[PDB]
Scaffold this active site. Structure first.
Site, PDB file in Angstrom:
ATOM      1  N   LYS A   7     -60.498 -13.198  26.202  1.00 37.92           N
ATOM      2  CA  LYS A   7     -60.461 -11.746  25.588  1.00 37.92           C
ATOM      3  C   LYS A   7     -61.756 -11.714  24.031  1.00 37.92           C
ATOM      4  O   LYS A   7     -62.118 -10.788  24.178  1.00 37.92           O
ATOM      5  CB  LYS A   7     -59.364 -11.137  25.404  1.00 37.92           C
ATOM      6  CG  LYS A   7     -59.270  -9.835  25.543  1.00 37.92           C
ATOM      7  CD  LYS A   7     -57.753  -9.016  25.805  1.00 37.92           C
ATOM      8  CE  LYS A   7     -58.175  -7.593  25.386  1.00 37.92           C
ATOM      9  NZ  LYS A   7     -56.320  -7.018  25.482  1.00 37.92           N
ATOM     10  N   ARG A  10     -65.117 -11.987  24.891  1.00 40.68           N
ATOM     11  CA  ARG A  10     -65.302 -11.313  25.869  1.00 40.68           C
ATOM     12  C   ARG A  10     -65.644 -10.045  24.649  1.00 40.68           C
ATOM     13  O   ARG A  10     -66.783  -9.554  24.020  1.00 40.68           O
ATOM     14  CB  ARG A  10     -64.823 -10.649  26.415  1.00 40.68           C
ATOM     15  CG  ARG A  10     -65.846  -9.842  27.223  1.00 40.68           C
ATOM     16  CD  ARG A  10     -64.969  -8.875  28.735  1.00 40.68           C
ATOM     17  NE  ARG A  10     -63.301  -8.428  28.050  1.00 40.68           N
ATOM     18  CZ  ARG A  10     -62.805  -7.339  27.609  1.00 40.68           C
ATOM     19  NH1 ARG A  10     -64.445  -6.597  27.439  1.00 40.68           N
ATOM     20  NH2 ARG A  10     -61.739  -7.232  27.486  1.00 40.68           N
ATOM     21  N   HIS A  12     -65.452 -11.271  21.014  1.00 39.87           N
ATOM     22  CA  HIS A  12     -65.855 -11.013  19.351  1.00 39.87           C
ATOM     23  C   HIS A  12     -66.507 -12.098  18.674  1.00 39.87           C
ATOM     24  O   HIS A  12     -67.536 -12.289  18.162  1.00 39.87           O
ATOM     25  CB  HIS A  12     -64.316 -11.871  18.515  1.00 39.87           C
ATOM     26  CG  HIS A  12     -63.480 -10.544  18.702  1.00 39.87           C
ATOM     27  ND1 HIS A  12     -63.864  -8.953  17.774  1.00 39.87           N
ATOM     28  CD2 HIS A  12     -63.034 -10.385  19.309  1.00 39.87           C
ATOM     29  CE1 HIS A  12     -62.986  -8.151  18.162  1.00 39.87           C
ATOM     30  NE2 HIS A  12     -62.146  -9.227  18.534  1.00 39.87           N
ATOM     31  N   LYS A  41     -63.467   2.523  22.221  1.00 40.66           N
ATOM     32  CA  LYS A  41     -63.006   2.145  20.493  1.00 40.66           C
ATOM     33  C   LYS A  41     -63.520   1.883  19.650  1.00 40.66           C
ATOM     34  O   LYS A  41     -64.657   1.616  18.960  1.00 40.66           O
ATOM     35  CB  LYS A  41     -63.168  -0.246  21.278  1.00 40.66           C
ATOM     36  CG  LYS A  41     -62.482  -0.995  20.201  1.00 40.66           C
ATOM     37  CD  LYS A  41     -61.748  -2.155  20.547  1.00 40.66           C
ATOM     38  CE  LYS A  41     -60.861  -3.569  20.114  1.00 40.66           C
ATOM     39  NZ  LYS A  41     -62.036  -4.367  19.366  1.00 40.66           N
ATOM     40  N   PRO A  42     -62.750   1.780  18.635  1.00 45.78           N
ATOM     41  CA  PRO A  42     -63.030   2.741  17.089  1.00 45.78           C
ATOM     42  C   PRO A  42     -63.330   1.456  16.567  1.00 45.78           C
ATOM     43  O   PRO A  42     -64.646   2.466  15.339  1.00 45.78           O
ATOM     44  CB  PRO A  42     -62.120   3.785  16.678  1.00 45.78           C
ATOM     45  CG  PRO A  42     -61.132   2.540  16.836  1.00 45.78           C
ATOM     46  CD  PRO A  42     -60.971   2.081  18.789  1.00 45.78           C
ATOM     47  N   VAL A  43     -63.454   0.710  16.639  1.00 47.04           N
ATOM     48  CA  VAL A  43     -63.833  -1.040  15.287  1.00 47.04           C
ATOM     49  C   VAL A  43     -63.642  -1.753  16.152  1.00 47.04           C
ATOM     50  O   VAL A  43     -63.038  -2.662  17.018  1.00 47.04           O
ATOM     51  CB  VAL A  43     -63.164  -0.844  13.694  1.00 47.04           C
ATOM     52  CG1 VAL A  43     -62.844   0.299  13.280  1.00 47.04           C
ATOM     53  CG2 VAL A  43     -61.890  -1.831  14.194  1.00 47.04           C
ATOM     54  N   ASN A  44     -65.150  -3.209  16.008  1.00 47.17           N
ATOM     55  CA  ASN A  44     -65.137  -3.679  16.880  1.00 47.17           C
ATOM     56  C   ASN A  44     -65.967  -4.770  15.441  1.00 47.17           C
ATOM     57  O   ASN A  44     -66.758  -4.800  15.118  1.00 47.17           O
ATOM     58  CB  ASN A  44     -65.317  -4.321  17.818  1.00 47.17           C
ATOM     59  CG  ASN A  44     -64.671  -5.757  18.681  1.00 47.17           C
ATOM     60  OD1 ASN A  44     -64.276  -6.463  18.896  1.00 47.17           O
ATOM     61  ND2 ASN A  44     -66.128  -6.059  19.299  1.00 47.17           N
ATOM     62  N   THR A  45     -65.922  -6.111  15.519  1.00 50.85           N
ATOM     63  CA  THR A  45     -66.460  -7.518  14.979  1.00 50.85           C
ATOM     64  C   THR A  45     -67.155  -7.966  15.838  1.00 50.85           C
ATOM     65  O   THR A  45     -66.457  -8.916  16.956  1.00 50.85           O
ATOM     66  CB  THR A  45     -65.930  -7.881  13.621  1.00 50.85           C
ATOM     67  OG1 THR A  45     -65.340  -7.042  12.567  1.00 50.85           O
ATOM     68  CG2 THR A  45     -67.032  -8.717  13.087  1.00 50.85           C
ATOM     69  N   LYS A  66     -52.015 -10.116   9.435  1.00 51.08           N
ATOM     70  CA  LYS A  66     -51.896  -8.743   9.046  1.00 51.08           C
ATOM     71  C   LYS A  66     -50.698  -7.773   9.410  1.00 51.08           C
ATOM     72  O   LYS A  66     -49.948  -6.463   9.278  1.00 51.08           O
ATOM     73  CB  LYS A  66     -52.874  -7.259   9.403  1.00 51.08           C
ATOM     74  CG  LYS A  66     -54.179  -7.457   9.186  1.00 51.08           C
ATOM     75  CD  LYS A  66     -55.210  -6.582   9.153  1.00 51.08           C
ATOM     76  CE  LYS A  66     -56.032  -7.152   8.077  1.00 51.08           C
ATOM     77  NZ  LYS A  66     -57.487  -5.788   8.518  1.00 51.08           N
ATOM     78  N   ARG A  85     -68.888   0.507  14.285  1.00 51.44           N
ATOM     79  CA  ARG A  85     -67.809   1.562  13.935  1.00 51.44           C
ATOM     80  C   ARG A  85     -68.029   2.723  13.896  1.00 51.44           C
ATOM     81  O   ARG A  85     -69.344   3.259  14.059  1.00 51.44           O
ATOM     82  CB  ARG A  85     -67.325   1.454  11.505  1.00 51.44           C
ATOM     83  CG  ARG A  85     -66.309   1.854  11.075  1.00 51.44           C
ATOM     84  CD  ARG A  85     -66.947   1.443   9.973  1.00 51.44           C
ATOM     85  NE  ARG A  85     -66.691   0.031   9.522  1.00 51.44           N
ATOM     86  CZ  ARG A  85     -67.054  -0.518   8.804  1.00 51.44           C
ATOM     87  NH1 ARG A  85     -68.066   0.387   7.406  1.00 51.44           N
ATOM     88  NH2 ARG A  85     -66.835  -1.872   7.742  1.00 51.44           N
ATOM     89  N   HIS A 119     -57.476 -13.609  18.593  1.00 45.79           N
ATOM     90  CA  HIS A 119     -57.087 -12.258  18.661  1.00 45.79           C
ATOM     91  C   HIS A 119     -58.444 -12.255  17.004  1.00 45.79           C
ATOM     92  O   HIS A 119     -58.136 -12.835  16.348  1.00 45.79           O
ATOM     93  CB  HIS A 119     -55.522 -11.933  17.630  1.00 45.79           C
ATOM     94  CG  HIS A 119     -55.551 -10.813  16.846  1.00 45.79           C
ATOM     95  ND1 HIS A 119     -55.731  -9.317  17.252  1.00 45.79           N
ATOM     96  CD2 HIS A 119     -55.226 -10.842  15.735  1.00 45.79           C
ATOM     97  CE1 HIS A 119     -55.461  -8.995  16.152  1.00 45.79           C
ATOM     98  NE2 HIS A 119     -55.239  -9.228  15.325  1.00 45.79           N
ATOM     99  N   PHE A 120     -59.225 -10.916  16.330  1.00 46.67           N
ATOM    100  CA  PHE A 120     -60.013 -11.110  15.353  1.00 46.67           C
ATOM    101  C   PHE A 120     -58.753  -9.903  14.385  1.00 46.67           C
ATOM    102  O   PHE A 120     -58.873  -9.173  14.570  1.00 46.67           O
ATOM    103  CB  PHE A 120     -61.305 -10.186  15.752  1.00 46.67           C
ATOM    104  CG  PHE A 120     -62.277  -9.957  14.580  1.00 46.67           C
ATOM    105  CD1 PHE A 120     -62.085  -9.631  13.424  1.00 46.67           C
ATOM    106  CD2 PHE A 120     -62.677 -11.903  14.003  1.00 46.67           C
ATOM    107  CE1 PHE A 120     -62.909  -9.977  12.234  1.00 46.67           C
ATOM    108  CE2 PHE A 120     -64.224 -11.703  12.858  1.00 46.67           C
ATOM    109  CZ  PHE A 120     -64.212 -11.002  12.700  1.00 46.67           C
ATOM    110  N   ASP A 121     -58.660 -10.810  13.053  1.00 44.47           N
ATOM    111  CA  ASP A 121     -57.117  -9.868  12.487  1.00 44.47           C
ATOM    112  C   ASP A 121     -58.627  -8.986  11.277  1.00 44.47           C
ATOM    113  O   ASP A 121     -57.947  -7.925  10.931  1.00 44.47           O
ATOM    114  CB  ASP A 121     -56.551 -10.698  11.776  1.00 44.47           C
ATOM    115  CG  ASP A 121     -55.454 -10.093  11.780  1.00 44.47           C
ATOM    116  OD1 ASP A 121     -54.997  -9.652  12.328  1.00 44.47           O
ATOM    117  OD2 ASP A 121     -54.542 -10.414  10.601  1.00 44.47           O
TER     118      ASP A 121
END
Length: 124
Positions: A7, A10, A12, A41-45, A66, A85, A119-121
């Site tokens: 995940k 996939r 990030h 999804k409102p935000v992703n990097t 966080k 975004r 997880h991308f923090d």
């Protein structure tokens, strides 16, 4: 089915492109990695570095997540990433994004054996 680590790749990892592709990178990438499936999804990097480079951050600088967990790590080097975004007028199922390309340090949470990103923090 899908492991947390799959995940992460996939969601990030985009090592195939070494910066942002174009004004439409995010629109294309948010769809094709399936981040517009159920909602927008409102935000992703996305990270444009090698897998091995990103996985190695799990042994770099240990910092607080966080959510207060202790298993987050910041990259010693900046990395090429793209922030996606979701815009104001984006309406699901036609999810629309602003593509920002930048070079920033990344922060990921790692778990498992092998100890790998799950997880991308943040990026800083």
């Amino acid at each position: 089915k899908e492991t947390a680590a799959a995940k992460f790749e996939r969601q990030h990892m985009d090592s195939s492109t070494s910066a942002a592709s174009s004004s439409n990178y995010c629109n294309q990438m948010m769809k094709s990695r399936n981040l517009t499936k159920d909602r927008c999804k409102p935000v992703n990097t996305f990270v444009h570095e090698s897998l091995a480079d990103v996985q190695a951050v799990c042994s770099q600088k240990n910092v607080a997540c966080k959510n207060g967990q202790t298993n987050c790590y910041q990259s010693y080097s900046t990395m090429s990433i793209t922030d996606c975004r979701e815009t104001g007028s984006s309406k699901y199922p036609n999810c629309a994004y602003k593509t920002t390309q930048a070079n920033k340090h990344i922060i990921v949470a790692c778990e498992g054996n092998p100890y790998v990103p799950v997880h991308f923090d943040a990026s800083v």
